[PDB]
Design a protein around this ligand. Sequence first.
Ligand SMILES: Nc1ncnc2c1ncn2[C@@H]1O[C@H](COP(=O)(O)OP(=O)(O)OP(=O)(O)O)[C@@H](O)[C@H]1O
Ligand SMILES: Nc1ncnc2c1ncn2[C@@H]1O[C@H](COP(=O)(O)OP(=O)(O)OP(=O)(O)O)[C@@H](O)[C@H]1O
Ligand SMILES: [Mg+2]
Ligand SMILES: [Mg+2]
Ligand SMILES: [Mg+2]
Ligand SMILES: [Mg+2]
Ligand SMILES: [Mg+2]
Ligand SMILES: [Mg+2]
Ligand SMILES: [Mg+2]
Ligand SMILES: [Mg+2]
Ligand SMILES: [Mg+2]
Ligand SMILES: [Mg+2]
Ligand SMILES: [Mg+2]
Ligand SMILES: [Mg+2]
Ligand SMILES: [Mg+2]
Ligand SMILES: [Mg+2]
Ligand SMILES: [Mg+2]
Ligand SMILES: [Mg+2]
Ligand SMILES: [Mg+2]
Ligand SMILES: [Mg+2]
Ligand SMILES: [Mg+2]
Ligand SMILES: [Mg+2]
Ligand SMILES: [Mg+2]
Ligand SMILES: [Mg+2]
Ligand SMILES: [Mg+2]
Ligand SMILES: [Mg+2]
Ligand SMILES: [Mg+2]
Ligand SMILES: [Mg+2]
Ligand SMILES: [Mg+2]
Ligand SMILES: [Mg+2]
Ligand SMILES: [Mg+2]
Ligand SMILES: [Mg+2]
Ligand SMILES: [Mg+2]
Ligand SMILES: [Mg+2]
Ligand SMILES: [Mg+2]
Ligand SMILES: [Mg+2]
Ligand SMILES: [Mg+2]
Ligand SMILES: [Mg+2]
Ligand SMILES: [Mg+2]
Ligand SMILES: [Mg+2]
Ligand SMILES: [Mg+2]
Ligand SMILES: [Mg+2]
Ligand SMILES: [Mg+2]
Ligand SMILES: [Mg+2]
Ligand SMILES: [Mg+2]
Ligand SMILES: [Mg+2]
Ligand SMILES: [Mg+2]
Ligand SMILES: [Mg+2]
Ligand SMILES: [Mg+2]
Ligand code: NA
Ligand code: NA
Length: 530
Amino acid sequence: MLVSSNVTMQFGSKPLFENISVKFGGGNRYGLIGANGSGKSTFMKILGGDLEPTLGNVSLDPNERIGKLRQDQFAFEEFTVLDTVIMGHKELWEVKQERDRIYALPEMSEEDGYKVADLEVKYGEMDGYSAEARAGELLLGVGIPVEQHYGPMSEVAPGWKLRVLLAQALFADPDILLLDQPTNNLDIDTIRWLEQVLNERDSTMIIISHDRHFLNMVCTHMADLDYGELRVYPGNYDEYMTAATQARERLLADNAKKKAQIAELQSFVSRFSANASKSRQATSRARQIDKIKLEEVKASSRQNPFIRFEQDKKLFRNALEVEGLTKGFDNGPLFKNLNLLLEVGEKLAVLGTNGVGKSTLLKTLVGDLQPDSGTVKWSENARIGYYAQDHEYEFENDLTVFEWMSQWKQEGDDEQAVRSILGRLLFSQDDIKKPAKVLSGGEKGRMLFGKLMMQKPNILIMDQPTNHLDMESIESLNMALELYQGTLIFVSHDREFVSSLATRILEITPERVIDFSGNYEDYLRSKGIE
RNA sequence: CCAUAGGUUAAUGAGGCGAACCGGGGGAACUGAAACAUCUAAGUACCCCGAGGAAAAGAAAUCAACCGAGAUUCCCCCAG
RNA sequence: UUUUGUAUAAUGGGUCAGCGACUUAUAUUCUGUAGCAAGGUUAACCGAAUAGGGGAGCCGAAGGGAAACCGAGUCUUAACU
RNA sequence: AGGACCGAACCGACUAAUGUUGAAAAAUUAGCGGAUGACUUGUGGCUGGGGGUGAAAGGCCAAUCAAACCGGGAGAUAGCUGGUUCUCCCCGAAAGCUAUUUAGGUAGCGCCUCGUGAAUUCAUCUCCGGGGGUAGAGCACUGUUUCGGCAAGGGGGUCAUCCCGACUUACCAACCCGAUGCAAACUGCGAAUACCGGAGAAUGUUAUCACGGGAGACACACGGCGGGUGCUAACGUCCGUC
RNA sequence: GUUUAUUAAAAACACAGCACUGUGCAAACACGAAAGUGGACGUAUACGGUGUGACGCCUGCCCGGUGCCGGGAGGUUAAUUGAUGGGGUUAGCGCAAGCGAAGCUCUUGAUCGAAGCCCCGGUAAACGGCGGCCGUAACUAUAACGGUCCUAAGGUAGCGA
RNA sequence: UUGAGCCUUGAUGUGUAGGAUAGGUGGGAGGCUUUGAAGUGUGGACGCCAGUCUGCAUGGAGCCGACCUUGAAAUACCACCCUUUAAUGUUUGAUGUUCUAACGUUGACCCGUAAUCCGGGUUGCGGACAGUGUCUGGUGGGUAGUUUGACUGGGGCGGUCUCCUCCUAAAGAGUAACGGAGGAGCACGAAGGUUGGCUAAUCCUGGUCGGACAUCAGGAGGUUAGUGCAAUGGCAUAAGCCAGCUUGACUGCGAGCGUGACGGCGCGAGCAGGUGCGAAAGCAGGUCAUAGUGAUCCGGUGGUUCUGAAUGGAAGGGCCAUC
RNA sequence: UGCCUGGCGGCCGUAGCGCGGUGGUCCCACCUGACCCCAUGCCGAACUCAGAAGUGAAACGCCGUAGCGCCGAUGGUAGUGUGGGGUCUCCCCAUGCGAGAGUAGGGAACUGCCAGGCA
RNA sequence: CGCGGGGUUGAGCAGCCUGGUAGCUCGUCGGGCUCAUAACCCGAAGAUCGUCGGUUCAAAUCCGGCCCCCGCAACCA
RNA sequence: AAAAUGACA
Ligand SMILES: Nc1ncnc2c1ncn2[C@@H]1O[C@H](COP(=O)(O)OP(=O)(O)OP(=O)(O)O)[C@@H](O)[C@H]1O
Ligand SMILES: Nc1ncnc2c1ncn2[C@@H]1O[C@H](COP(=O)(O)OP(=O)(O)OP(=O)(O)O)[C@@H](O)[C@H]1O
Ligand SMILES: [Mg+2]
Ligand SMILES: [Mg+2]
Ligand SMILES: [Mg+2]
Ligand SMILES: [Mg+2]
Ligand SMILES: [Mg+2]
Ligand SMILES: [Mg+2]
Ligand SMILES: [Mg+2]
Ligand SMILES: [Mg+2]
Ligand SMILES: [Mg+2]
Ligand SMILES: [Mg+2]
Ligand SMILES: [Mg+2]
Ligand SMILES: [Mg+2]
Ligand SMILES: [Mg+2]
Ligand SMILES: [Mg+2]
Ligand SMILES: [Mg+2]
Ligand SMILES: [Mg+2]
Ligand SMILES: [Mg+2]
Ligand SMILES: [Mg+2]
Ligand SMILES: [Mg+2]
Ligand SMILES: [Mg+2]
Ligand SMILES: [Mg+2]
Ligand SMILES: [Mg+2]
Ligand SMILES: [Mg+2]
Ligand SMILES: [Mg+2]
Ligand SMILES: [Mg+2]
Ligand SMILES: [Mg+2]
Ligand SMILES: [Mg+2]
Ligand SMILES: [Mg+2]
Ligand SMILES: [Mg+2]
Ligand SMILES: [Mg+2]
Ligand SMILES: [Mg+2]
Ligand SMILES: [Mg+2]
Ligand SMILES: [Mg+2]
Ligand SMILES: [Mg+2]
Ligand SMILES: [Mg+2]
Ligand SMILES: [Mg+2]
Ligand SMILES: [Mg+2]
Ligand SMILES: [Mg+2]
Ligand SMILES: [Mg+2]
Ligand SMILES: [Mg+2]
Ligand SMILES: [Mg+2]
Ligand SMILES: [Mg+2]
Ligand SMILES: [Mg+2]
Ligand SMILES: [Mg+2]
Ligand SMILES: [Mg+2]
Ligand SMILES: [Mg+2]
Ligand SMILES: [Mg+2]
Ligand code: NA
Ligand code: NA
């Protein structure tokens, strides 16, 4: 079973995590939780050996095939989907490709023949004969068609190849699964399939997830990464959240009721110390006061960012109008004969879930995706704040966080007012010196929220604004957008964030759009969903 | 019911005292540590039991070092 | 006697006579003296025995290093002018 | 009838005097409270030491009680007090520094003494080579101070009190200039002494240094000079040197 | 009535009366290393512990703290049990390095595990506690009155230099 | 009744592309059915719901591998097994009801006995509970041993206790007071090394917002500025300010000194081995210097044939680096 | 050898500032150009290169001047080692040492080694 | 002046709790309901966070001085 | 459901 001892990673002048030593193993599944920027991804990198710790150890058995997940790479793109999911087995992939190379190079001499016979028997023991079949029976579960199973990695879509990268990790029942945010930008049906296929396995799995309904579904232990110490509570999710609460409140109460007695042994020392017949008794109360040592409270890293979008110039009457916006890439009718008029104050939630033009509507509205036919007439003064689903291009350039946030300073504000946004977004003194490239996913979504806030738009378009954000962030931004007085266009899958704030639903089905004029609860009752 | 428990008679032995030495059952504290609790004083003082002219121990399931010695007890070194 | 300092009004003693306080054992070191002198000396014990025997053993003539080890050298160091 | 009333025996002990080496290691004299009751008394018995008994005071347990008396461990320990016994000859201190559960104890060093071994070793004076920053002094610097000159600028009165300031100002006033002082924590100056080193005589029973045996002492006092504190008070208190 | 025999005889102690609490009998409680004794040759109208101290009128509010009583769902938790992992040794395969069966060993400690504590409620003739600031009435004065903060609750009847 | 282990028996473990809900080995492929059928007449359970397993029979005597699409073949079947399992057995557990036989009886009767002790015998009632022993968690002033600092203008309170800078400090060093004043318990991968260059404060005159004070251009001034941090001493050859390259913020040593009662602390040319900057002479063993810190014991981690209690190993010690 | 000039020193204001004058054959400075060898947080202003029309304006060197800076006696004063004295918070006497400020005054340097030109 | 607790709109108080948001209950002011007042409903007003300085991009918060108010304390033989 | 008050003459 995997063990870690005193990992202690540190880049800067503040503790990140200290003397982490924990045994992971035994078939238990450890949901690893924390704040949006504490330690989780750089800890599953350490557990897999991607970066060695500053000073520490990670111990694994001589043969224990780590099945870990991507989302630190996107561009393998040299071979077919079948042989892309195959190479999750780093052992079998090498023997397979090496024997193919040997077959390519002439001839099978005695060095070549004896080099190849044992590799062939190794392949047989590893059952590579039925490797592609078992890979395909998993690609079908993920949702990739049989007729294009054998297509190269350029045939696949950019939003469809993360599916294959997910399928790679859990290929052939590998013990110890390092899953790093697997359910992000996935649908309800795929999430249900994944949480069903992980429920039939005896393999320790350490999973990062910022949602509650998946951790509370699959996980057994609830390893935390807050305060610095990795506190592991054996609990589902709710018996962790109801245990840490009283664990912290007991500490607070003990400090209160132990300071309240120092304040009582102090009223005697302050009154009878100078006396002669009572100084002996007043200088033993001082010993009692000094021998108390109330224990310290360190604030949790969770916190709650203060986000609020305002609007510089409110605009009246219609804010948008879309007239005959038929468009499709290679399936033709991505959305057929769209026709709509968006008023002011609308909170339009565009639903519909998977591969259909759930996005590319927002891309056409902003204009970066030219439509096939139609014209989109924004309001006269319409200023659009765009939060793209894939926002890497704005951080590939490596500026300091301060300069990156200062790019968008407007006419009438200082770099005193620039740093206030970062302060409200919880970038304190060193995390404003990091390169913009090296930041967490949630710490990056927040940094885009602080650019929208800084620009102060009157039309907000947001492609999945609930990505890599913990409960605190999707509770702050939810009310930040609720208080918003303006036009909002957003898309999300979780049936809570969209239901909290929406006055109109426009969801597209791969044959025809359907529009509504009420909130999501009425939408479901009219659909026939209980 | 047999039988045991119990009763009577007879034969033999013991009982108490004594200075030290000896074997065993229990077992302090002052004191030293420049305070004190681990530790020392010390298995000492003292209490109790038992025997002897002495008592205990004693004839390797011991040491040694692959060379060997040969029960126990006491004295001088090893050795502060 | 104790004190920086007592005629001190600081302590002790009424006087006489007798008793009353740096000792003994074993180890170690330095001085003096005596014997022997790269040698010196025995302990227990035997012994008609303060003689003689007994040299088990102790101290000294070689040191350096934590140690193996080397040895008028040795340790340090990869090596030391 | 009565934990009833007055009052002797009987039990007790509120006040005063005497007595304090007493008649007595708690009493006598004149008064005083209870006196059929939770009373008082004779004889015998039981409870024993961290234990007894206690209408409760730490009271009583053989003139002894916040832990009896006797014997033993025992000659407990005492950084504290006292005492320490015959004679002569030579040398002869310290009451300081450092450390201390340390401050009236002790350890190392400084000072004393005995032995051994060594070089003009050491001391005084004359001459030569040195570094000061004290006394004194000075006011360029750091502060402080009083005058006089020029006065930036600043407060006050009149008028459109939008401006510009159109004015004024008996009043304040920095920086510079000339004159006059003060400073432990000021110095563009600067002694006497003292101290370090070298050379030279004369003088001094090696007075110098090293090693080894034995210590004592680490409570100081006053007087002159230089000073901190105090009141330039104290036979006050804390340092330097004699 | 008792008390410091021998400097204190009192307002101190005891008391009848009152209340709380323990005790179902081989009672609780005490003296005992234990046997056994007192309680008691008694049986809840009896016995022990604690406080108050005839009698008359009465004995207010607070369960946050500390005790005591009841509750057991949940968390933590000893001995006991010893699943796993790591190391030592070595029959052998290799005369290279090196691995290394069985056994014996050193260590690590999964699982089981009660009371207590955390938690929930009660109890004050259980130990105990019982508030600040500001304004306001026909002359002055004072506030019956009002605002607010805090507390577990803010000292009631009676008495008061 | 309910946990857990084990054994025996039977099921369940399609997505394609297949006749059809095939688990992997491979034995065979011609074998399964008449001690009485594929279908039928009819039960229940399971499910990706398409389909599988089972009682018996009026009748019943016949179904599949050969083909075929797959990486792979078939309830023709048996085998040794794997996952989820269902049932009966068997092992210890937990719980609850009964029982008597250990154990209790300070219930009744008889005897030793002329005995409200004790013992034995019948009987009744409790009954594997209570109680006792070893180990163990809680409570435990009921009891016992003890600790509860020093300086100090008497003691107590207040203040202080180690390190750095100035004055007292009497022109070498040192020098006290509960004397007068301030600081430290770090920081910096550049604020370290080298090479190349550069020189400040403060006013005086001319200009957009622009002002007494911002940037510009002249002149006076002279280090009155600056130094990561308190003060003192320094600093122009700059130790102050920029830039290029770099890691000497190296290893073993070290003549000779300074300062301490010691433990110790500090300065150091030069030597050897390997570097950096510079063309080169050369400079670099952290920073302008002085604060930024605690012995020993005990223990942890890494290296090293030094030792290894018969011998070969090992534990354990030692040494080096470090916590 | 005499004069001028350049480099390296000695010495460090009696040596430095201010005012006036003067020097271009050589030397020195300014000077022309800049693609390139090099360089500017922009600018050949600085650093650097190829040359040489002009000038001695500025800088530099030399000479003259006291308006500053600077040096500075003699005498007296203060202080002080040793020995004495007083009316002793401070002084005095014998003896030895003897400033600081100020005054008279001095004063716009002196000098070595090479290398060029005019002699 | 030795030690604590404070100074936040007119009154009484949070926010200091590890600097990025100035808030509560009552009150004042202007409307509405009412015959009229009170209550009630709506809208707004106002604080140099006692006053000075310091690192700080940013102070009420962190540090120090000064002033004011409330409690103490300044011992025994 | 909440609804208090109105000097004398
Ligand atoms: N190179 C880097 N330099 C500085 N900080 C870094 C660097 N790489 C990562 N970090 C920091 O490490 C942390 C990583 O946070 P982490 O990835 O666990 O966040 P998350 O959003 O919770 O994770 P996840 O993406 O897995 O859901 C962040 O605080 C990030 O700033
Ligand atoms: N850049 C592109 N180049 C080519 N085809 C594209 C591109 N972007 C999208 N597509 C095609 O258009 C389709 C629409 O994708 P779209 O972004 O609308 O999906 P989605 O519902 O937002 O996906 P998801 O939730 O997985 O991110 C894609 O599935 C793909 O086939
Ligand atoms: Mg006998
Ligand atoms: Mg002792
Ligand atoms: Mg002692
Ligand atoms: Mg015998
Ligand atoms: Mg004396
Ligand atoms: Mg005296
Ligand atoms: Mg005399
Ligand atoms: Mg006398
Ligand atoms: Mg005396
Ligand atoms: Mg006398
Ligand atoms: Mg006599
Ligand atoms: Mg005698
Ligand atoms: Mg030797
Ligand atoms: Mg009577
Ligand atoms: Mg009477
Ligand atoms: Mg009477
Ligand atoms: Mg009496
Ligand atoms: Mg009396
Ligand atoms: Mg009488
Ligand atoms: Mg008595
Ligand atoms: Mg006692
Ligand atoms: Mg003794
Ligand atoms: Mg004695
Ligand atoms: Mg003499
Ligand atoms: Mg003493
Ligand atoms: Mg002076
Ligand atoms: Mg002393
Ligand atoms: Mg002394
Ligand atoms: Mg003295
Ligand atoms: Mg004196
Ligand atoms: Mg009395
Ligand atoms: Mg009472
Ligand atoms: Mg009451
Ligand atoms: Mg009884
Ligand atoms: Mg006690
Ligand atoms: Mg003792
Ligand atoms: Mg004291
Ligand atoms: Mg000095
Ligand atoms: Mg001196
Ligand atoms: Mg001295
Ligand atoms: Mg530096
Ligand atoms: Mg340089
Ligand atoms: Mg430097
Ligand atoms: Mg420094
Ligand atoms: Mg061995
Ligand atoms: Mg052995
Ligand atoms: Mg070892
Ligand atoms: Na990440
Ligand atoms: Na998308």
